Amino acid sequence: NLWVTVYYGVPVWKEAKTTLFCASDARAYEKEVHNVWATHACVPTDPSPQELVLGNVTENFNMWKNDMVDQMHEDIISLWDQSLKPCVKLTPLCVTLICSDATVKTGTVEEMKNCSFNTTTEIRDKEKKEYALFYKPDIVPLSETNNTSEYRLINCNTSACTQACPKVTFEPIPIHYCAPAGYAILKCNDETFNGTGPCSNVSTVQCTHGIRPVVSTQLLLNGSLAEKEIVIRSENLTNNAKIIIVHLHTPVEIVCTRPNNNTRKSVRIGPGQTFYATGDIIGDIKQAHCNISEEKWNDTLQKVGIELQKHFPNKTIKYNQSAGGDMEITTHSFNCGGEFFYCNTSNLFNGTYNGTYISTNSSANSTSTITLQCRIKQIINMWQGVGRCMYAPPIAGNITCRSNITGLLLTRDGGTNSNETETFRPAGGDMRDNWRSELYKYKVVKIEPLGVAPTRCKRRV
Amino acid sequence: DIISLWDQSLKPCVKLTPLCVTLICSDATVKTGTVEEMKNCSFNTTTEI
Amino acid sequence: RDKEKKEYALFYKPDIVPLSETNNTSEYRLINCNTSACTQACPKVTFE
Amino acid sequence: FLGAAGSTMGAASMTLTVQARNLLSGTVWGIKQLQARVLAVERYLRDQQLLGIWGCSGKLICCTNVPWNSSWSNRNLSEIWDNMTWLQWDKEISNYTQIIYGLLEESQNQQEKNEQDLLALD
Amino acid sequence: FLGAAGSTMGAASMTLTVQARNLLSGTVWGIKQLQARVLAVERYLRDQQLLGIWGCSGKLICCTNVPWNSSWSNRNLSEIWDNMTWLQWDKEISNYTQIIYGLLEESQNQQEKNEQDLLALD
Amino acid sequence: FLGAAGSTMGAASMTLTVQARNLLSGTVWGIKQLQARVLAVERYLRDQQLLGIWGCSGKLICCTNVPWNSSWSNRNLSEIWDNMTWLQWDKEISNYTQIIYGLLEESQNQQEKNEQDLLALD
Numbered sequence A: 001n002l003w004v005t006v007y008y009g010v011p012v013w014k015e016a017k018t019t020l021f022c023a024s025d026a027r028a029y030e031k032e033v034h035n036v037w038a039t040h041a042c043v044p045t046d047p048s049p050q051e052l053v054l055g056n057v058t059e060n061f062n063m064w065k066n067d068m069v070d071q072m073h074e075d076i077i078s079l080w081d082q083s084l085k086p087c088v089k090l091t092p093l094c095v096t097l098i099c100s101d102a103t104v105k106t107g108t109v110e111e112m113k114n115c116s117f118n119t120t121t122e123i124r125d126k127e128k129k130e131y132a133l134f135y136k137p138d139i140v141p142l143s144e145t146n147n148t149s150e151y152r153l154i155n156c157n158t159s160a161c162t163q164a165c166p167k168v169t170f171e172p173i174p175i176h177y178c179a180p181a182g183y184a185i186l187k188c189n190d191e192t193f194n195g196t197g198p199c200s201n202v203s204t205v206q207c208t209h210g211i212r213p214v215v216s217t218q219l220l221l222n223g224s225l226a227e228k229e230i231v232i233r234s235e236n237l238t239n240n241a242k243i244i245i246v247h248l249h250t251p252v253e254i255v256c257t258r259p260n261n262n263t264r265k266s267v268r269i270g271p272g273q274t275f276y277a278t279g280d281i282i283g284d285i286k287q288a289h290c291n292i293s294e295e296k297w298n299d300t301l302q303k304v305g306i307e308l309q310k311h312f313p314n315k316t317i318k319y320n321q322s323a324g325g326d327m328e329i330t331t332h333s334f335n336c337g338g339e340f341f342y343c344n345t346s347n348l349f350n351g352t353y354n355g356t357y358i359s360t361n362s363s364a365n366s367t368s369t370i371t372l373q374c375r376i377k378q379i380i381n382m383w384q385g386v387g388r389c390m391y392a393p394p395i396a397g398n399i400t401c402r403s404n405i406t407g408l409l410l411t412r413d414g415g416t417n418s419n420e421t422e423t424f425r426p427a428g429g430d431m432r433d434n435w436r437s438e439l440y441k442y443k444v445v446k447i448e449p450l451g452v453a454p455t456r457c458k459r460r461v
Numbered sequence B: 001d002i003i004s005l006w007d008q009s010l011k012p013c014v015k016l017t018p019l020c021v022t023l024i025c026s027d028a029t030v031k032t033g034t035v036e037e038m039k040n041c042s043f044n045t046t047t048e049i
Numbered sequence C: 001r002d003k004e005k006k007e008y009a010l011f012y013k014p015d016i017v018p019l020s021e022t023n024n025t026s027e028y029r030l031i032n033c034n035t036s037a038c039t040q041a042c043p044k045v046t047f048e
Numbered sequence D, E, F: 001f002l003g004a005a006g007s008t009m010g011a012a013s014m015t016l017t018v019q020a021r022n023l024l025s026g027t028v029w030g031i032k033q034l035q036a037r038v039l040a041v042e043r044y045l046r047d048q049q050l051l052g053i054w055g056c057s058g059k060l061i062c063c064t065n066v067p068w069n070s071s072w073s074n075r076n077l078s079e080i081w082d083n084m085t086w087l088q089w090d091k092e093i094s095n096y097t098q099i100i101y102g103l104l105e106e107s108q109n110q111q112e113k114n115e116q117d118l119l120a121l122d
């Protein structure tokens, strides 16, 4: 009667975990073999990906329990460490610094400080007096001070910092994540994808698209855009300690600059190792800042309020400053060129939206620009101290960088007094939320090509 | 396996090269309690600076 | 780490260089000091 | 690849060979590349070893001389092969698997020893 | 190994198994030896997988039920199998390889489903 | 696994598939796990490659069309298959192995070329 039969190559799958690998987009790496993300070691994706939509397939999704984002976080940490490993270590520079003054008066921000010390030459006996201009957030007054002019570095009582090599470029080259053979990556195709829940349109692929590992807090930069509508993603939307990833549809352009003409000098420390620092500032001293259009940012906040009032019905939402904390927590972190900006964002997230469409200024046109000021550090302790601290070497000349804004990382500070006005503050710092906004579509599965079924057919014996 | 596991466990920890200095040592357990074995030693350590 | 001791050795003439800012004095350093720190070969290693 | 994931079982009777042709072809990144290269070989060889133990290796569709138990049977042939998809089948059949696999293995060895005894008695 | 590289096509039809028995068996140097050990397994399993997809795996010489197109045909059988060696053939026939291989794959799956329908109708 | 190590040769003729079932898939420790994972694949693929070269791969019990020489023959069939065990056989027959293996290889290729010439002459 009915005899059991086995089929090889059935199209079924199951949920599993595996070690995906990088694959670049065959960019010209004949001279740029010095990138920090080592993308020249990735497999060149010469052909187009196997983009096939399945049809009549439903799959359940949950990206907060994804393992791809944890793997990508560990890859970024290990790439950073193995790029920062063979460079110069700044252990002989942690000495007593005599810092008088560098800027002539208060100026814009007098964050320069003229610190001199006794560096060590190639000869272990002769020590030489040297000077350099350090930024104000890098130097601390020395312990047991009688308001004296003795300063040390921020990192000396915590961990020694290795500087970045000057040939290493921090440019975010796109990275494709590819599953091994025998696995697959299934992605959603709903244009109004919640983030969790099932999808009615699923396609298959072997390699994800070219996501840019862009490191920034608060505002997201250079990301992928949503298709037609602003998408608001969160784990619960009722727990106040869950970061809301807002995904815009139209990008907003930001222009960030450090305008003062800075120089670079090399201080020899030990045999064969140098140390690059700020030598002098040529010309006038101006303020490092960033510029956004005010009308476009108001329209973007108004549309985010439109999309957010339907999840908090019959309420007014009200944007505010970031919470209490240090500069590295509150300020919008940023990096272009190689200089690590930290921008203020207190006049940016400022206003409110109730149910009525308050401003119809999109019908008119204005050239008013919001300008937010940014400080600049050298010594960074990023990813909460799980990675090593780095001294970013200075860059001669002025720096400019155009960028887009595709996402926001908000948080809620509701309470009993928030019965009509709802507070939404900027927040960030958990760096895997940056890469949850790019790996929202994808899921990894393992194919199981053995199948068991009866055919009412017997083996010929 | 025991040797290599021991070496990789002691690999990332603190090295005591700066501790090897001249120690000025006087007896702390000066009493004749037939134990002794604890010598109070002072030295010039190096701070972060 | 405290007690330093005076010690001599006979070095070949291409290895030593007169020190910087010399008034034709008798101060010499190694050739490799301003280029890269140099590790000696182990004596049990054979170059055959 | 996986073009008939939502189709019927019989519609997978012509596209089951394209799921079998993509199963092998495809220093941090060096480590990940090496681990992926070993994983693909392992996942191919496990399925080939199970097919060889069942004895119907070298072909895609088999017949295994073992009756289908009524505890596993719930539908008719048209209902299974014309309405349900392979993923729903794999969801609803997945229990009682290792006893099926052992039954196929001992049936294959019984076939081998019976054929060898028949040829030795020739 | 490779002793009939300069001989004719027919003369390589008795020594094609000696070149199939050397295909598998044969910390800087540890890394190089590990990479060589993985590459040998990959290069053997790719050819075995293609032979399995064509359905004639387990034997050295096959016949594949697919006509030889006139766009590929240029010589006679005596000229091919008695005058030319395998190297000139591998130089000259190498185009249309993917469509030849796909034709063999679909022909093998058609044979499998036709045989299964014949045994099911029995 | 290995449950019939002390039984007769015929008594291992029904449980010889359980040894083939467990033959695959049964940073210091990461290195040891990686080396073990490569070693299992190599040791499985070597036996499968030899069985494919002899041409009787895909089955557990073979017949190889080659006469048993009197220089290897010392006992009767009942004495071999009812009194001696397989480990004693592996101890006592182990010489003249490569000659037997090459004879099986050339016999298989002769069978392939004879069958292909018979089908080409059809």
Ligand SMILES: *[C@@H]1O[C@H](CO)[C@@H](O[C@@H]2O[C@H](CO)[C@@H](O[C@@H]3O[C@H](CO[C@H]4O[C@H](CO)[C@@H](O)[C@H](O)[C@@H]4O)[C@@H](O)[C@H](O[C@H]4O[C@H](CO)[C@@H](O)[C@H](O)[C@@H]4O)[C@@H]3O)[C@H](O)[C@H]2NC(C)=O)[C@H](O)[C@H]1NC(C)=O
Residues within 6 Å of the ligand: A102, A114, A116, A129, A130, A131, A279, A280, A281
């Ligand atoms: C940040 O802090 C550093 C150090 O704390 C300052 O750097 C020093 O700045 C002074 C002031 O400009 C420099 O002194 C000048 O140096 C010129 C060239 O240097 C050579 O000559 C001097 C001897 O004069 C040597 O000591 C030195 O090693 C070099 O060999 C000289 O030409 C200048 O001399 C003129 O002025 C003096 C009076 O000051 C007169 O007596 C002379 O006759 C002549 O007219 C002057 O000496 C000094 O060289 C700088 N370096 C160091 C290591 O001390 C930075 O200026 C300060 N600010 C900024 C923005 O970086």
Ligand SMILES: *[C@@H]1O[C@H](CO)[C@@H](O[C@@H]2O[C@H](CO)[C@@H](O[C@@H]3O[C@H](CO[C@H]4O[C@H](CO)[C@@H](O)[C@H](O)[C@@H]4O)[C@@H](O)[C@H](O[C@H]4O[C@H](CO)[C@@H](O)[C@H](O)[C@@H]4O)[C@@H]3O)[C@H](O)[C@H]2NC(C)=O)[C@H](O)[C@H]1NC(C)=O
Residues within 6 Å of the ligand: A032, A169, A171, A172, A214, A216, A221, A222, A334, A335, A336, A337, A338, A400, A401, A402, A403, A404
């Ligand atoms: C979001 O995405 C935008 C778009 O890419 C980023 O903006 C880029 O930022 C990078 C720096 O991070 C810029 O790269 C630098 O550009 C400088 C200017 O290049 C222009 O001018 C030269 C000379 O006229 C032209 O040849 C060139 O084609 C450009 O028109 C370069 O001077 C820099 O060169 C550096 O690298 C080379 C190669 O290694 C070295 O030889 C140099 O010495 C130097 O080290 C560098 O290439 C880039 O121009 C920006 N693009 C745009 C469109 O503005 C944002 O940074 C990004 N956001 C974040 C947060 O990363």
Ligand SMILES: *[C@@H]1O[C@H](CO)[C@@H](O[C@@H]2O[C@H](CO)[C@@H](O[C@@H]3O[C@H](CO[C@H]4O[C@H](CO)[C@@H](O)[C@H](O)[C@@H]4O)[C@@H](O)[C@H](O[C@H]4O[C@H](CO)[C@@H](O)[C@H](O)[C@@H]4O)[C@@H]3O)[C@H](O)[C@H]2NC(C)=O)[C@H](O)[C@H]1NC(C)=O
Residues within 6 Å of the ligand: B028, B040, B041, B042
């Ligand atoms: C092993 O060896 C070590 C060092 O060799 C000993 O450690 C020292 O022990 C002495 C004796 O107890 C300590 O001296 C005492 O310190 C107390 C607190 O210390 C502060 O104040 C003193 C100034 O008095 C500073 O020098 C010091 O840095 C701290 O800021 C004081 O309260 C004590 O003062 C009292 O006694 C003196 C007389 O000795 C009177 O003049 C005072 O008025 C007051 O009554 C005293 O000075 C010393 O601090 C310890 N540390 C060091 C680094 O020297 C161990 O005791 C020894 N044994 C063991 C078992 O470990």
Ligand SMILES: *[C@@H]1O[C@H](CO)[C@@H](O[C@@H]2O[C@H](CO)[C@@H](O[C@@H]3O[C@H](CO[C@H]4O[C@H](CO)[C@@H](O)[C@H](O)[C@@H]4O)[C@@H](O)[C@H](O)[C@@H]3O)[C@H](O)[C@H]2NC(C)=O)[C@H](O)[C@H]1NC(C)=O
Residues within 6 Å of the ligand: A397, A398, A399, A400
């Ligand atoms: C250091 O500061 C310099 C002074 O600002 C920077 O130069 C500026 O670079 C930007 C690039 O974003 C240029 O903006 C472009 O302008 C053109 C229009 O060009 C016309 O107008 C300019 C006005 O100065 C004129 O110089 C030209 O000849 C043209 O007539 C736009 O089409 C582009 O879209 C873009 O907006 C500035 O024009 C340019 N200013 C000057 C004075 O050259 C310089 O980039 C800074 N250094 C670094 C490394 O960034």
Ligand SMILES: *[C@@H]1O[C@H](CO)[C@@H](O[C@@H]2O[C@H](CO)[C@@H](O[C@@H]3O[C@H](CO)[C@@H](O)[C@H](O)[C@H]3NC(C)=O)[C@H](O)[C@H]2NC(C)=O)[C@H](O)[C@H]1NC(C)=O
Residues within 6 Å of the ligand: A222, A251, A402, A403, A404
């Ligand atoms: C930030 O936002 C900008 C606009 O908001 C983006 O600028 C657009 O980028 C598109 C993609 O690179 C461009 O489309 C391409 O344009 C060229 C020139 O006409 C065509 O040849 C290409 O076919 C076309 N690409 C496609 C897929 O059709 C847009 O022209 C360009 N400008 C506008 C006004 O839309 C920035 O790319 C974006 N990112 C950054 C880093 O600035």
Ligand SMILES: *[C@@H]1O[C@H](CO)[C@@H](O[C@@H]2O[C@H](CO)[C@@H](O[C@@H]3O[C@H](CO)[C@@H](O)[C@H](O)[C@@H]3O)[C@H](O)[C@H]2NC(C)=O)[C@H](O)[C@H]1NC(C)=O
Residues within 6 Å of the ligand: A096, A097, A098, A116, A117, A118, A129
């Ligand atoms: C770097 O090295 C220089 C040496 O080239 C140091 O300068 C010396 O500093 C000491 C103090 O640490 C000075 O001693 C002082 O002498 C005066 C009298 O002149 C006395 O009143 C003080 O109480 C103190 O004893 C010394 O004069 C000075 N110069 C020399 C040539 O030795 C310098 O301190 C080191 N550090 C820095 C940060 O520059």
Ligand SMILES: *[C@@H]1O[C@H](CO)[C@@H](O[C@@H]2O[C@H](CO)[C@@H](O[C@@H]3O[C@H](CO)[C@@H](O)[C@H](O)[C@@H]3O)[C@H](O)[C@H]2NC(C)=O)[C@H](O)[C@H]1NC(C)=O
Residues within 6 Å of the ligand: A140, A154, A157, A158
């Ligand atoms: C290593 O040294 C640095 C510098 O001394 C230490 O940073 C200091 O940490 C303390 C404790 O968090 C800070 O004090 C706090 O200041 C805030 C205002 O910013 C005030 O509101 C709090 O009540 C508290 O007093 C201190 O400001 C900070 N110093 C600087 C310059 O920021 C660091 O803690 C040391 N690390 C270790 C492990 O010893």
Ligand SMILES: *[C@@H]1O[C@H](CO)[C@@H](O[C@@H]2O[C@H](CO)[C@@H](O[C@@H]3O[C@H](CO)[C@@H](O)[C@H](O)[C@@H]3O)[C@H](O)[C@H]2NC(C)=O)[C@H](O)[C@H]1NC(C)=O
Residues within 6 Å of the ligand: A326, A327, A330, A331, A344, A345, A346, A347
């Ligand atoms: C980002 O920018 C905003 C505005 O530019 C900064 O907020 C303002 O910071 C100043 C500090 O100079 C505050 O002035 C002082 O505040 C203290 C504490 O309330 C008060 O006791 C003093 O009398 C004086 O008013 C100012 O209140 C504050 N807010 C506004 C609306 O101006 C902010 O500090 C910047 N940085 C960060 C990390 O947010």
Ligand SMILES: *[C@@H]1O[C@H](CO)[C@@H](O[C@@H]2O[C@H](CO)[C@@H](O[C@@H]3O[C@H](CO)[C@@H](O)[C@H](O)[C@@H]3O)[C@H](O)[C@H]2NC(C)=O)[C@H](O)[C@H]1NC(C)=O
Residues within 6 Å of the ligand: A295, A298, A299, A301, A302, A350, A351, A352, A353, A358, A359, A361
């Ligand atoms: C840009 O967006 C902001 C908010 O998204 C718009 O400003 C807001 O306008 C309303 C009414 O025009 C303000 O409400 C009232 O403000 C007064 C000011 O003291 C207050 O006393 C009243 O109780 C009431 O709340 C609201 O404060 C204001 N928000 C601000 C200024 O941050 C603005 O109209 C938009 N501009 C454009 C050009 O689109």
Ligand SMILES: *[C@@H]1O[C@H](CO)[C@@H](O[C@@H]2O[C@H](CO)[C@@H](O[C@@H]3O[C@H](CO)[C@@H](O)[C@H](O)[C@@H]3O)[C@H](O)[C@H]2NC(C)=O)[C@H](O)[C@H]1NC(C)=O
Residues within 6 Å of the ligand: B022, B023, B024, B042, B043, B044
């Ligand atoms: C740790 O560092 C301290 C310095 O804070 C050292 O103390 C100093 O030691 C020297 C000898 O190495 C003392 O010099 C002596 O001076 C007397 C006259 O007072 C003379 O008779 C001796 O022949 C010798 O020259 C010095 O006084 C003393 N104190 C200071 C403030 O310099 C100490 O030796 C170092 N080592 C240890 C193990 O503590």
Ligand SMILES: *[C@@H]1O[C@H](CO)[C@@H](O[C@@H]2O[C@H](CO)[C@@H](O[C@@H]3O[C@H](CO)[C@@H](O)[C@H](O)[C@@H]3O)[C@H](O)[C@H]2NC(C)=O)[C@H](O)[C@H]1NC(C)=O
Residues within 6 Å of the ligand: C017, C031, C034, C035
């Ligand atoms: C590290 O220090 C050494 C020793 O001071 C430097 O070697 C010196 O390099 C210069 C430039 O090549 C040599 O000058 C040349 O000498 C030749 C004669 O040999 C002459 O014909 C040229 O016109 C030129 O003047 C110099 O002789 C040489 N010193 C010795 C002792 O051979 C080396 O350049 C330094 N490296 C760095 C990176 O600073």
Ligand SMILES: *[C@@H]1O[C@H](CO)[C@@H](O[C@@H]2O[C@H](CO)[C@@H](O)[C@H](O)[C@H]2NC(C)=O)[C@H](O)[C@H]1NC(C)=O
Residues within 6 Å of the ligand: A051, A052, A053, A189, A201, A202, A203
């Ligand atoms: C399901 O998703 C697929 C993949 O995104 C959609 O196919 C795309 O359709 C657009 C038409 O707007 C084409 O331009 C693209 O080329 C298609 N993608 C590919 C890979 O070919 C499909 O339309 C979606 N279907 C539904 C019902 O949502």
Ligand SMILES: *[C@@H]1O[C@H](CO)[C@@H](O[C@@H]2O[C@H](CO)[C@@H](O)[C@H](O)[C@H]2NC(C)=O)[C@H](O)[C@H]1NC(C)=O
Residues within 6 Å of the ligand: A318, A320, A321
């Ligand atoms: C943004 O948040 C700050 C948090 O401090 C708000 O400031 C408080 O406002 C309430 C309103 O009555 C006062 O009672 C508190 O004393 C304020 N705290 C401080 C430290 O000043 C601020 O009002 C918020 N912004 C808006 C527009 O609501």
Ligand SMILES: *[C@@H]1O[C@H](CO)[C@@H](O[C@@H]2O[C@H](CO)[C@@H](O)[C@H](O)[C@H]2NC(C)=O)[C@H](O)[C@H]1NC(C)=O
Residues within 6 Å of the ligand: A346, A347, A350, A351
């Ligand atoms: C948020 O925006 C409002 C107006 O857009 C700011 O209120 C004005 O602030 C300036 C300078 O602080 C004052 O000169 C005006 O008188 C203020 N106008 C009103 C109506 O209050 C407000 O300061 C902004 N918030 C922050 C934190 O800067």
Ligand SMILES: *[C@@H]1O[C@H](CO)[C@@H](O)[C@H](O)[C@H]1NC(C)=O
Residues within 6 Å of the ligand: A194, A195, A196, A197, A232, A233, A234, A235, A236, A237
């Ligand atoms: C949509 O998203 C919100 C926030 O992520 C979540 O609370 C809600 O359950 C989601 N709804 C569905 C149908 O997935």
Ligand SMILES: *[C@@H]1O[C@H](CO)[C@@H](O)[C@H](O)[C@H]1NC(C)=O
Residues within 6 Å of the ligand: A313, A314, A355
């Ligand atoms: C909330 O707002 C909507 C639209 O403005 C309105 O229809 C509804 O009645 C409001 N809810 C309550 C409880 O009034």
